[PDB]
């Protein structure tokens, strides 16, 4: 499928709009993103912040000002003519029921499929909390795409100024397992469909990995064979340094 790539300028901007706005009482901060969604890799080069207010007890009441949409368009076209509105982002990982109503507001302004961006301001997860969903025909479903970081000298350089393998992956696997454990327990309390369909396919596709263990060790010893000649070459580097240091000792005594 497609891919989502976001520069750290957009990631840091969405995370800094929570403290500046001083949003409290468990509310959300909605903002718009700019970029080019026409290619297979969506690149977000710009982001903004718009005022958003929605009632917690009533999900049928929402308000969004359209002046900021027309004001930022006239502002960007006078600066960067290659940037258009590809969608919008939210302030939290948890999805609400208003995602379908907000999608109808930008469908007239956006000339392509609206991109749903999800950014966690709390950063209570592991790895990259930022999520990217794509709304397509289901009524409507949200297809998620992997989010990456843009590699360029216009962004990552400023990151290096501010700031300055499997062990991390195993901790990420525990996060995915705990999500399925709580989903099954909470499902039984509400009773006594798409999740159960894909759950039985995981078990049948690590008890099954033991059948290939006979053929697994075939390429495992090759690593040790590659490491055997790897360690032998390491002696030629250390012994040559000993011979080099031995010649330095003779130069200091004769001096």
């Amino acid at each position: 499928h497609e891919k989502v790539t976001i520069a750290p300028l957009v990631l840091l901007s969405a995370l800094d709009h929570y403290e500046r706005t001083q949003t409290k009482e468990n509310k959300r901060c909605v903002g718009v993103i700019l970029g080019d969604a026409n290619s297979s890799t969506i690149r977000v080069t710009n982001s903004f912040a718009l005022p958003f207010e929605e009632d917690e007890k009533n999900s049928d009441v929402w308000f969004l000002d359209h002046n900021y949409i027309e004001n930022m368009n006239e502002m960007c076209k006078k600066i960067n003519a290659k940037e258009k509105l590809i969608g919008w982002y939210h302030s939290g990982p948890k999805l609400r029921a208003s995602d379908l109503k907000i999608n109808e507001l930008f469908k007239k302004y956006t000339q392509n499929n609206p991109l749903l961006l999800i950014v966690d301001v709390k950063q209570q997860g592991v790895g990259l909390p930022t999520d990217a969903y794509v709304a397509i025909e289901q009524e409507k479903t949200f297809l998620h795409l992997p989010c990456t970081i843009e590699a360029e000298e216009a962004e990552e350089i400023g990151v290096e100024h501010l700031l300055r393998i499997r062990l991390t992956n195993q901790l990420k696997s525990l996060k995915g397992l705990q999500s399925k454990l709580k989903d099954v327990v909470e499902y039984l309390d509400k009773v006594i469909h798409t999740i159960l369909g894909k759950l039985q396919d995981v078990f049948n596709l690590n008890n099954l990995q033991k059948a290939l263990t006979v053929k697994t060790n075939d390429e495992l010893m090759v690593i040790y064979i590659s490491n055997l000649v790897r360690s032998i070459i390491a002696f030629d580097d250390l012994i040559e340094n000993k011979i080099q240091n031995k010649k330095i000792q003779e130069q200091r005594v004769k001096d």
Binding site: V214, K215, N217, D218, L220, M221, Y224
Partner: peptide, 8 residues
């Protein structure tokens, strides 16, 4: 023994 773990 190429299929076993003994040389490992």
């Amino acid at each position: 023994i190429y299929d076993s773990e003994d040389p490992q």
